[PDB]
Design a protein that fits this description.
Chain A: It is an enzyme of class 6 (ligase). Chain A: Catalyzes the attachment of tryptophan to tRNA(Trp) in a two-step reaction: tryptophan is first activated by ATP to form Trp-AMP and then transferred to the acceptor end of the tRNA(Trp). Chain A: The modification N6-succinyllysine is found at residue 55. The structure is a homodimer. By secondary structure, chain A is of the alpha/beta class. Chain A has two domains: 1-247, Rossmann fold (3-Layer(aba) Sandwich); 248-364, Tyrosyl-Transfer RNA Synthetase (Orthogonal Bundle), CATH 1.10.240. The first copy, chain A, has 18 helices and seven strands. Chain A has helices spanning 2-8, 17-25, 31-35, 44-52, 75-88, 98-104, 109-125, 138-141, 148-157, 161-167, 176-180, 182-186, 215-227, 259-267, 291-299, 303-315, 324-343, 347-353, and strands spanning 11-12, 40-42, 57-63, 92-96, 133-137, 205-211, 234-238. Chain A has a seven-stranded mixed sheet, sandwiched between helices. Chain A binds chain B through residues 99, 102-103, 109, 139, 142-150, 153-154, 156-162, 164-165, 170, 172-177, 179-180, 182-183, and chain B through 117, 120-121, 127, 157-158, 160-168, 171-172, 174-180, 182-183, 189-198, 200-201.
Chain lengths: 364, 379
């Protein structure tokens, strides 16, 4: 990961920049920062500069509404974005790319759109404030903005096929909606794409939380920005979420019960311990390629108890199955609590989050 | 004829584009002697001259528009205009006044797409400028006399961002046209901006009732009829291919020949104009100056098949017998060029003068109304 930074030319967060946040925030850096889940960035300093100089900034993230079974991995950006929203108290804009799924998959426009509404339930279950978050459907919001399509057009002019052909790999057997889709993903990065929220303001920086594997796709947007008179969108990159069986039982869905969660991490997670304990008691603990532990890295909020689990699993004291039932006690209460929060999401709360509204934000 | 596209029209021949051949290549159908009567019977009106003199000579499924009009099932008219700049020419009047004619004789709603996004992409303009031209060009279009309770005129940049139905159709059409197909119709290249690669779906979209929920109450099946010069047909031949794939009725069409450029019937009157157009902004003096000096004569006698003045006469005189008398006469030698041009100047001068007058009457508030999404009158 330290070599993917140099590869994409991004800036690495320290344990010193993390402090800069704490000074304006007034909290304790989220464990993603503390642990390095979210390690890289691009222009966080620029966003920070305006936060103290008493100027707003906003967040943006999206979601590809392809059915659901949003697994626990998919929670990583949202958990972090939610945090960002609360410590800075700024607006967030969440995009549901229904057109995209329609273009790429065997769905009807309605089918893609219903998935967008449903996924929006799961997202709201994460707890986003309703007074500073706007979840929008591409298909819906294009028809309801006096600023969105215009920005999409500006981008479409300043980007050629050859450009989108290298970055995304589009060939020419593809449909045109695809070739031009990258402009729809980019448009949300610029404030005046949301008139009911921001107005015709253009000086509001945009912070985009996402992976590190994504930087090459967001550079297109960052490169077009100067060219159209708009500031670049800042970035905060994260690491990947270990695929369960190894880096259908392949992932752990938020719709999974409690026993399924139990039987998955027990029968399908990956082990680093010599596990087939010839005599794992002073060996075993490979906390780099052991999924169960990697997960605790994301979901167990206590550093002290985590380090204890690492010293102990690596040393050989803690066997496998012991570490596993430790994770289960973190997931089961994470997932089940998610499902409950999502039960309380009425058809009217969804419609609200998805309605072009004025928001309550920190101009500061 | 050789080349006819949405951006260029070229022929080696002074007689102009071979229209019976364009019909074979494009796959459209010739407007028969007997299809014209059906228009008469069905509308109880004499067919407009463009129909009688073969100016609008090609169609697609007009028999299906009539199939429905006869049975009391509506249909609507859709046509468009790319505002490349503020000034339009007299060739532009052909599709519009004919559309104004279809509107009255059939009494059906009409939508007119002002493609500001198309020109913002293809040309060097700001979004402000591109919208500006849409507004100005709408005044001239309005000057043709369209019923305000029966016509919707929209800028693409504005209507895309305010319609619960337009973008959705663009997206649907976009899924069914590959870059490969689009570069084999419009000749696009890997160097073109993405906005241009996908632009075709935006022109294809008004071809479906759905993009105007406010007009046809989310009805989805109202038959569409599109009047246009035959250089806009690649867009619509693409559209009719896509329509069934997204469960919509294919749009019908009526193609017109091109109003020749002054120098000859090799190109069409365009706004580039090295010096080839009579702008709807020209003074009586300029119109006369342009006809006498710039309009290719044929003549020196008289060959009607190449005289740019006589071609113009077949578009705006409106007296089949006089035109026919001007034909035999110019051919035989009796008429003698300066008289022929003198005649044409007597028709164009008032035509453009009445246009300007009515245009001066289009107040800002009227442009606004025509361009606001409305219900219309179930026309």
């Amino acid at each position: 990961y330290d070599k993917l930074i140099v590869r994409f030319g991004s800036s690495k967060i320290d344990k010193e920049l993390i402090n800069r946040i704490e000074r304006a925030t007034g909290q304790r850096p989220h464990h993603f920062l503390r642990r390095g889940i979210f390690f890289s960035h691009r222009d966080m300093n620029q966003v920070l500069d305006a936060y103290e100089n008493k100027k707003p900034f906003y967040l943006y993230t999206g979601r590809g509404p392809s059915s659901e079974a949003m697994h626990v991995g998919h929670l990583i950006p949202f958990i972090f974005t939610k945090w960002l929203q609360d410590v800075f108290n700024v607006p967030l804009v969440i995009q549901m790319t229904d057109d995209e799924k329609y273009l790429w998959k065997d769905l009807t426009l309605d089918q893609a759109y219903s998935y967008a509404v449903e996924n929006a339930k799961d997202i709201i279950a994460c707890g986003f404030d309703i007074n500073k978050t706007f979840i929008f459907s591409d298909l819906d919001y294009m028809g309801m903005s006096s600023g969105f399509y215009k920005n999409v057009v500006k981008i479409q002019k300043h980007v050629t096929f050859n450009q989108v052909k290298g970055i995304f790999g589009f060939t020419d057997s593809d449909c045109i909606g695809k070739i031009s889709f990258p402009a729809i993903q980019a448009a949300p990065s610029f404030s005046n794409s949301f008139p009911q929220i921001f107005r015709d303001r253009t000086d509001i920086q945009c912070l985009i939380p996402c992976a590190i594997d994504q930087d090459p796709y967001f550079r297109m947007t960052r490169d077009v920005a100067p060219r159209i008179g708009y500031p670049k969108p800042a970035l905060l990159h994260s690491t990947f979420f270990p695929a369960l069986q190894g880096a259908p039982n392949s992932s752990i869905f938020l719709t999974d019960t409690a026993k399924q969660i139990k039987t998955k991490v027990n029968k399908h997670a990956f082990s680093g311990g010599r596990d087939t304990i010839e005599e794992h008691r002073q060996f075993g603990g490979n906390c780099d390629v052991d999924v169960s532990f990697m997960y605790l890295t994301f979901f167990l909020e206590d550093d002290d108890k985590l380090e204890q689990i690492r010293k102990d699993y690596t040393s050989g004291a803690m066997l496998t199955g012991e570490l596993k039932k430790a994770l289960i006690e973190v997931l089961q209460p994470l997932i089940a609590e998610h499902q409950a929060r999502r039960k309380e999401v009425t058809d009217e709360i969804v419609k609200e989050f998805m309605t072009p509204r004025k928001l309550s934000f920190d101009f500061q």
